Design an enzyme around this catalytic site. Structure first.
Site, PDB file in Angstrom:
ATOM      1  N   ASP A 179      10.122   3.771   0.786  1.00  0.00           N
ATOM      2  CA  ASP A 179       8.917   4.550   0.503  1.00  0.00           C
ATOM      3  C   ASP A 179       9.312   5.815  -0.271  1.00  0.00           C
ATOM      4  O   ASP A 179      10.262   6.502   0.102  1.00  0.00           O
ATOM      5  CB  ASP A 179       8.208   4.958   1.806  1.00  0.00           C
ATOM      6  CG  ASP A 179       6.699   5.123   1.616  1.00  0.00           C
ATOM      7  OD1 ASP A 179       6.210   4.692   0.560  1.00  0.00           O
ATOM      8  OD2 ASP A 179       5.998   5.654   2.508  1.00  0.00           O
ATOM      9  N   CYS A 213       1.666  -1.858  -1.606  1.00  0.00           N
ATOM     10  CA  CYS A 213       2.812  -1.298  -0.897  1.00  0.00           C
ATOM     11  C   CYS A 213       2.091  -0.691   0.304  1.00  0.00           C
ATOM     12  O   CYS A 213       1.254  -1.364   0.887  1.00  0.00           O
ATOM     13  CB  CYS A 213       3.552  -0.227  -1.738  1.00  0.00           C
ATOM     14  SG  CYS A 213       2.482   0.910  -2.672  1.00  0.00           S
ATOM     15  N   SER A 214       2.372   0.551   0.691  1.00  0.00           N
ATOM     16  CA  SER A 214       1.638   1.103   1.829  1.00  0.00           C
ATOM     17  C   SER A 214       0.313   1.723   1.380  1.00  0.00           C
ATOM     18  O   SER A 214      -0.740   1.403   1.925  1.00  0.00           O
ATOM     19  CB  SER A 214       2.469   2.152   2.580  1.00  0.00           C
ATOM     20  OG  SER A 214       1.792   2.556   3.768  1.00  0.00           O
ATOM     21  N   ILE A 217       0.030   2.774  -4.509  1.00  0.00           N
ATOM     22  CA  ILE A 217       0.107   3.623  -5.689  1.00  0.00           C
ATOM     23  C   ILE A 217       1.501   3.966  -6.200  1.00  0.00           C
ATOM     24  O   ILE A 217       1.710   4.002  -7.417  1.00  0.00           O
ATOM     25  CB  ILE A 217      -0.696   4.965  -5.500  1.00  0.00           C
ATOM     26  CG1 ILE A 217      -0.075   5.823  -4.405  1.00  0.00           C
ATOM     27  CG2 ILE A 217      -2.164   4.669  -5.164  1.00  0.00           C
ATOM     28  CD1 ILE A 217      -0.823   7.114  -4.160  1.00  0.00           C
ATOM     29  N   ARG A 219       5.076   2.583  -5.224  1.00  0.00           N
ATOM     30  CA  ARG A 219       5.848   1.388  -5.546  1.00  0.00           C
ATOM     31  C   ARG A 219       4.986   0.402  -6.342  1.00  0.00           C
ATOM     32  O   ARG A 219       5.452  -0.165  -7.348  1.00  0.00           O
ATOM     33  CB  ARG A 219       6.375   0.776  -4.252  1.00  0.00           C
ATOM     34  CG  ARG A 219       7.413   1.690  -3.579  1.00  0.00           C
ATOM     35  CD  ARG A 219       7.792   1.279  -2.154  1.00  0.00           C
ATOM     36  NE  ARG A 219       6.802   1.707  -1.171  1.00  0.00           N
ATOM     37  CZ  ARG A 219       6.891   1.466   0.131  1.00  0.00           C
ATOM     38  NH1 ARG A 219       7.930   0.793   0.614  1.00  0.00           N
ATOM     39  NH2 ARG A 219       5.937   1.890   0.951  1.00  0.00           N
ATOM     40  N   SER A 220       3.732   0.206  -5.912  1.00  0.00           N
ATOM     41  CA  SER A 220       2.811  -0.698  -6.624  1.00  0.00           C
ATOM     42  C   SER A 220       2.657  -0.280  -8.084  1.00  0.00           C
ATOM     43  O   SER A 220       2.696  -1.114  -8.978  1.00  0.00           O
ATOM     44  CB  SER A 220       1.426  -0.700  -5.968  1.00  0.00           C
ATOM     45  OG  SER A 220       1.495  -1.221  -4.657  1.00  0.00           O
ATOM     46  N   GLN A 260       4.727   7.715  -7.699  1.00  0.00           N
ATOM     47  CA  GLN A 260       4.727   8.882  -6.827  1.00  0.00           C
ATOM     48  C   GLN A 260       5.858   9.888  -6.921  1.00  0.00           C
ATOM     49  O   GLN A 260       5.802  10.928  -6.256  1.00  0.00           O
ATOM     50  CB  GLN A 260       4.560   8.422  -5.371  1.00  0.00           C
ATOM     51  CG  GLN A 260       3.132   8.013  -5.039  1.00  0.00           C
ATOM     52  CD  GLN A 260       2.202   9.208  -4.926  1.00  0.00           C
ATOM     53  OE1 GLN A 260       2.318   9.998  -3.992  1.00  0.00           O
ATOM     54  NE2 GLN A 260       1.281   9.351  -5.880  1.00  0.00           N
TER      55      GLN A 260
HETATM   56  O1  LIG Z   1       6.460   5.294  -3.212  1.00  0.00           O
HETATM   57  C1  LIG Z   1       5.460   5.144  -2.525  1.00  0.00           C
HETATM   58  C2  LIG Z   1       4.742   6.237  -1.836  1.00  0.00           C
HETATM   59  C3  LIG Z   1       3.865   5.645  -0.769  1.00  0.00           C
HETATM   60  C4  LIG Z   1       2.703   6.503  -0.297  1.00  0.00           C
HETATM   61  C5  LIG Z   1       1.999   7.376  -1.248  1.00  0.00           C
HETATM   62  C6  LIG Z   1       0.895   8.224  -0.772  1.00  0.00           C
HETATM   63  C7  LIG Z   1       0.507   8.178   0.643  1.00  0.00           C
HETATM   64  C8  LIG Z   1      -0.636   9.015   1.159  1.00  0.00           C
HETATM   65  C9  LIG Z   1      -0.158  10.094   2.131  1.00  0.00           C
HETATM   66  N1  LIG Z   1      -1.332  10.681   2.762  1.00  0.00           N
HETATM   67  S1  LIG Z   1      -1.105  11.765   4.084  1.00  0.00           S
HETATM   68  O2  LIG Z   1      -2.707  11.649   4.755  1.00  0.00           O
HETATM   69  O3  LIG Z   1       0.155  11.096   4.992  1.00  0.00           O
HETATM   70  C10 LIG Z   1      -0.937  13.399   3.425  1.00  0.00           C
HETATM   71  C11 LIG Z   1       0.391  13.967   3.202  1.00  0.00           C
HETATM   72  C12 LIG Z   1       0.525  15.310   2.622  1.00  0.00           C
HETATM   73  C13 LIG Z   1      -0.685  16.068   2.276  1.00  0.00           C
HETATM   74  C14 LIG Z   1      -2.008  15.486   2.509  1.00  0.00           C
HETATM   75  F1  LIG Z   1      -3.203  16.226   2.143  1.00  0.00           F
HETATM   76  C15 LIG Z   1      -2.140  14.153   3.086  1.00  0.00           C
HETATM   77  C16 LIG Z   1       0.600  11.171   1.381  1.00  0.00           C
HETATM   78  N2  LIG Z   1      -0.078  11.998   0.462  1.00  0.00           N
HETATM   79  C17 LIG Z   1       0.902  12.846  -0.092  1.00  0.00           C
HETATM   80  C18 LIG Z   1       0.607  13.906  -1.133  1.00  0.00           C
HETATM   81  C19 LIG Z   1      -0.440  13.448  -2.153  1.00  0.00           C
HETATM   82  C20 LIG Z   1       0.003  12.178  -2.885  1.00  0.00           C
HETATM   83  C21 LIG Z   1      -1.031  11.701  -3.861  1.00  0.00           C
HETATM   84  C22 LIG Z   1      -0.974  12.161  -5.257  1.00  0.00           C
HETATM   85  C23 LIG Z   1      -2.005  11.725  -6.200  1.00  0.00           C
HETATM   86  C24 LIG Z   1      -3.083  10.833  -5.736  1.00  0.00           C
HETATM   87  C25 LIG Z   1      -3.135  10.371  -4.342  1.00  0.00           C
HETATM   88  C26 LIG Z   1      -2.104  10.806  -3.398  1.00  0.00           C
HETATM   89  C27 LIG Z   1       2.186  12.538   0.491  1.00  0.00           C
HETATM   90  N3  LIG Z   1       1.970  11.488   1.414  1.00  0.00           N
HETATM   91  C28 LIG Z   1       1.208   7.309   1.590  1.00  0.00           C
HETATM   92  C29 LIG Z   1       2.307   6.474   1.119  1.00  0.00           C
HETATM   93  S2  LIG Z   1       3.350   4.066  -1.423  1.00  0.00           S
HETATM   94  O4  LIG Z   1       3.201   2.909  -0.227  1.00  0.00           O
HETATM   95  O5  LIG Z   1       1.986   4.418  -2.394  1.00  0.00           O
HETATM   96  N4  LIG Z   1       4.920   3.936  -2.347  1.00  0.00           N
END
Ligand SMILES: O=C1C[C@@H](c2ccc(C[C@H](NS(=O)(=O)c3cccc(F)c3)c3nc(CCCc4ccccc4)c[nH]3)cc2)S(=O)(=O)N1
Length: 297
Positions: A179, A213-214, A217, A219-220, A260
């Site tokens: 991830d 993926c999870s 966005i 890895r996908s 990401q």
């Molecule tokens: O390489 C990857 C990353 C994974 C991944 C990406 C994003 C998330 C969403 C997650 N949401 S929260 O509710 O845990 C969360 C965490 C921090 C702040 C917050 F408010 C909510 C997440 N979002 C961010 C930052 C934002 C990432 C993002 C950027 C543009 C568009 C959409 C999302 C970092 N992790 C989860 C897994 S994947 O399975 O898409 N493969």
């Protein structure tokens, strides 16, 4: 393409290039995703499908699923990018695969990564324990699987209980892509990709391949960006014309946050540059990738 790569490395500007993409990326409404009745259908509150490109389920009740149709016009390929299904949206996921006539499903994560659930167990792991999704009237059976060192290919039989029609769905599961990380090498990624391409699952005679993926966005996005750029290099009269950043921005019009990390972007460059060798004729790179990927371990 390797000239720009080379100058980005030396300038040490991957983070800056990446942030520019984040800043220039489209931003469209996600109203249906954010409706209160759809809350338990989203794995992450901050990852939603845009209304204009969302995939609609054919059920009268609630047609919502966190999925997006990414339609790359020039490359002529379409993909559906979705989150790892949740316990309550597994029926929904197979309903979309059925209604959209998809033939293959590309999974780039594991159900549990580093001690955290990232996706539900939406397909059966044992031949003898098929799964039934009552709410959608579909049956899913594991027919067989070819397990490799870093990925597994599964043959699944999906059946519409109502009409008793059945379909063979191919499952391509990359088990070693961390991830927020990257594949072990361009070689094992490309090896995996061309395995999906060679299966027929990406043919325009079928519905869009479903990739996830999870969050659907990071890895996908990396998987789809490399496949699309390689498709373009094989189409255009000058493969060095492919601007990966522009292609990434085009993809982001359809679903948010594709790619990401700055490193996933740099990896995408490596996968495409490496893969171009096969697109230009090199007939020894494919076997070379297999060897380097140590798939028969
Ligand atoms: O390489 C990857 C990353 C994974 C991944 C990406 C994003 C998330 C969403 C997650 N949401 S929260 O509710 O845990 C969360 C965490 C921090 C702040 C917050 F408010 C909510 C997440 N979002 C961010 C930052 C934002 C990432 C993002 C950027 C543009 C568009 C959409 C999302 C970092 N992790 C989860 C897994 S994947 O399975 O898409 N493969």
């Amino acid at each position: 393409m390797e000239k720009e790569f080379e100058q980005i490395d030396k300038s040490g500007s991957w983070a800056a290039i990446y942030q520019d993409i984040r800043h220039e990326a489209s931003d469209f409404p996600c109203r249906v995703a954010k409706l209160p009745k759809n809350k338990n259908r989203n794995r992450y509150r901050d990852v939603s499908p845009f209304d204009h490109s969302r995939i609609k389920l054919h059920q009268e009740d609630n047609d919502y699923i966190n999925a997006s149709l990414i339609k790359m016009e020039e490359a002529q390929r379409s993909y559906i990018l979705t989150q790892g299904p949740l316990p309550n949206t597994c029926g929904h996921f197979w309903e979309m695969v059925w209604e959209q006539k998809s033939r293959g499903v590309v999974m780039l994560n594991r159900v549990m990564e580093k001690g955290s659930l990232k996706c539900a167990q939406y397909w059966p792991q044992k031949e003898e324990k098929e799964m039934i999704f009552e709410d959608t009237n579909l049956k899913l059976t594991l027919i067989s699987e070819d397990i490799k060192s870093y990925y597994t290919v599964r043959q699944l039989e999906l059946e519409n209980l109502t009409t008793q029609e059945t379909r063979e769905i191919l499952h391509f599961h990359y088990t070693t892509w961390p991830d927020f990380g990257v594949p072990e090498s361009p070689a094992s990624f490309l090896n995996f990709l061309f395995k999906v391409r060679e299966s027929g699952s990406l043919s325009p005679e079928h519905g869009p391949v479903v990739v996830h993926c999870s969050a659907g966005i990071g890895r996908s996005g990396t998987f789809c960006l490399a496949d699309t750029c390689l498709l373009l290099m094989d189409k255009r009269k000058d493969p060095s014309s492919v601007d990966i950043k522009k292609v990434l921005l085009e993809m982001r019009k359809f679903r948010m946050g594709l790619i990401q990390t700055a490193d996933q972007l740099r990896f995408s460059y490596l996968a495409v540059i490496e893969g171009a060798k096969f697109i230009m004729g090199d007939s020894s790179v494919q076997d070379q990738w297999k060897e380097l990927s140590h798939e028969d371990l």
